[model samples]
Target: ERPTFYRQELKTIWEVPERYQNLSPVGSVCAAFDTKTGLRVAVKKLSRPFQSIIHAKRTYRELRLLKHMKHENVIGLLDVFTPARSLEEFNDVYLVTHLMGADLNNIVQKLTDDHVQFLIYQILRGLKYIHSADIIHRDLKPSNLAVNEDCELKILDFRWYRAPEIMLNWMHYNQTVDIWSVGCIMAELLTGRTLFPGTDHIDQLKLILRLVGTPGAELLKKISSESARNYIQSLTQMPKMNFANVFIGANPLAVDLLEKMLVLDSDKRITAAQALAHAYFAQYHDPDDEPVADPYDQSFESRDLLIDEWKSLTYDEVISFVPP
Candidate 1:
């Protein structure tokens, strides 16, 4: 995914001394540094060769899409490169972004029950930024969210991102996907495990239906194809369920926000920006209440720094990280 003309000038991330041995191995990915500049960064090396052509193409697609996106809550891109040795041998691409604190997944995993609400506020705030840009981060799971020591939330992993207007038949690939993921993340944070650990996509879909109730009949009819219609129809059988009552003494407001996000109608699901206005969070969150020391200052000053970095990204530089 490197730019055609910039190949010779590009340096391996490991070549930078400051970044060497700086890589933090978390989950399936690693965070490293810019060897030349000693800049703190992160990268996710693929475990196996991309098994599908669609995936290979998506790698290029993500690189391109990320180029245009710039937001404080979003991670910034530094550059992309395949190791100097071989593209196949490395079979990896670097995602160089400014180093931040622990991810929401780790924070939630380690938290006591009392701390969950504070984390939720941070998560919702980050989501608001994403939705403001008109980009739906289709995957909004806790693992994909990063949290600084200051409790600022940064959304990561945009492979599933897409504009709301992009239509694939009657199904609109939009921010609703993100809302669904957020609901799942909320459930996981409260319970300390996956709320819907379905064995496969079918099971996952069913689980969602159970919690949110199935989409209405008109919504089902909106699917243009018979296959799509039938798929939606199958979801109707699951009994109506709600998270508010499911968790052992969960905050009522947290449950309310979760329910809004999990709504079956994609159109009705709350957007990140809209969620910010929700009474559940706005009424409860207090600036004076300190939970954790925020590592990255999320004030206007910090936002300026992020915006400056984003402005410096050239199209070629942007393309390297983005997929075609």
Candidate 2:
């Protein structure tokens, strides 16, 4: 039997008693009580679904990806629908997801080593699933990592905390981009602060080099932009810092994993699956445990959508969506 689906007209079924404290201007999120399930849920309403092609594409990707993914470590999409009574009036997109305790940013500083290990393991588990589906999160930061009091974590937000390759406009980038961000997040969890707190792209790169050192010739050769490559080469080479010193009192194995993830060369960085198997997580690793299969075909390649095509595609998706 088909599962029951609810629409905006049935607001009484899902009552929004309060708005999320950190609601964004671009969108609004509220804490709602589901009368049917007698449970709490997060209701996210896209402020303007048709604001622009970029806005439309982001909404489409978020909804599509979340719907296609099913993992214990990833955020769950409970339902999706539009408020409009007709296609011509459609302007808002609503997403309902499991309510989390809080984002990692809220409590990362208070985490213990055990907490860190558990959270990182869950993060890598989620990333492994995403990478296996040929999706790079692009954004992996404290704020984007959601967690509950139970220490369970779920990765969120794909629009920010971009990798170095994207910042430099590299011709191509893959799942490795996420590894870099994971490295940053690990550092923050260990030190209670951001590793590279730069104001802009150039400053961010500078901060990265200051601690990680410059890339070797082989890695530099892969850069498609001669100007960017030359600019990086012009800077004086800095020595890489010891992770032990940076993350004082951190476990040796944890430091080792951080170094592997924070490699200056993306190609040299460890993958999510590889990170999960590292000695740092040896105690937590389960040989028989396998990631949940992606709901969609793994054979499909993920790529950037063209603007015009994305706009039309998003519009069609909005109008045709069946709420559930």
Candidate 3:
């Protein structure tokens, strides 16, 4: 049966939009009160559905990943549904999760060093579980991270984030790609500005080089294309910038961690697990207490399916969630 699970008063869920200060997220996020559960929940609508087989696969991948993930520091997929009654009209999908108070950027200046440590610690904690599942959050920026009044943090928006190796077209770039974003995020947290605010693809590379200096001739052999290698080599020889001066008045321990995270070579970058152990987070690091989730089965992602085929599979998946 086709159904709309929310009521009018529950429409208070729409108030979450005001929570966004200067950020906009993909799709539509609505807060709703589900009578089935007394607590309110945020409902996220997929912006577009099946625009192509690739997009369909992405939706499938994201939904399945969210469904599979259950971490205190990662957005949890509480429930899901679609307003459509049948396959033909099933063009939209909605996912429900706990309503977070605000995204992180709104509180940038409001945070203390202790808050930063806890928040960053939680992010690493969440990432460790996600990376353990062999999944890398390609877009783990500030806006993508959800924060509560309690100062608890959660990682959301799992679609895509970029890494230098990835930008350089590395053939075998791995989850450490997330480390690059983590570095960028860390820098922003400290400086109140985007670390490498590349206006475009080319500018982005230039900005990265300016901050970290030029990569060596070795390039550590990660880049998969000669064009990229040649391009970087042709650029002016820039030296690595000082973190202490850039991250003024910040803890040396945090500054030291940034150097490792923003390393030009992916091979040398710090990992979420290793980062959690860094002295910057020494006040909260606990190996035995930090949990690891089961590796997600990405078999679905590797499949090549037609839009119609994906839609049918996606339909089955969305419907199956109602009984969850």
Candidate No. with top TM-score = 3
1-324 in candidate 1: lDDT tens per residue? 322221211223233223345555651456665565666666554333244444444544455455544555667566555443433243445555667788765664345544665566666666655565555565566667787777776777762111122322335546666766677777777777777776655565555567666767766655667886686675446656756578767778777888787666677778766666667666545544322212322132233223223323222343344422
RMSD (CA, Å), each prediction: 10.3, 5.3, 5.4
Worst 10 residues of 1 by lDDT: 159-168
| Model 3 C-alpha lDDT versus the unseen true structure | 0.77
lDDT of 2 by residue, 1-324 (tens): 223444332322232223322222226776676665665677887766656766766777777777777778888677666545555555667787877778877885356887788888889988888888877777677888888777788887652245778677686677889988888888788888788888888788888887888877888888778887888798998888788888889988989999999887777889988899998887688856748455454231254556556656656765556544
Judge candidate 1 at residue 253 and give its lDDT: 72
The lDDT for every candidate, in the order shown, is 0.56, 0.73, 0.77
Off by over 4 Å in 1: 1-14, 17-39, 43-69, 78-95, 108-114, 159-170, 227-236, 283-324
What is the lDDT, from 0 to 100, of the residue 111 in candidate 2?
A: 68
Q: How close is candidate 1 to the true structure, as a TM-score?
A: 0.62
Per-residue error at 213 for model 2, in Å?
Answer: 1.3
Displacement of residue 207 (Cα, Å) in model 1 is 2.1
Q: Count clashes in each candidate, considering only residues at least 3 apart in sequence or on different chains.
A: 18, 0, 5
Identify the runs in model 3 with alpha carbons over 4 angstroms from their true place. Answer: 1-27, 45-56, 82-92, 159-161, 220-224, 306-308, 319-324
Tens-digit lDDT string for candidate 3 (1-324): 444333222222222222222212326675555556665677777767689998898888777877888888988788777656789988878777887778877766535677678888998999999999888787677788888878889888771136877775566667888888888877777777778777777788888888899987666365667886687678789999998988989889989999999888776789999999999998999999889999788888678878999889888887777333
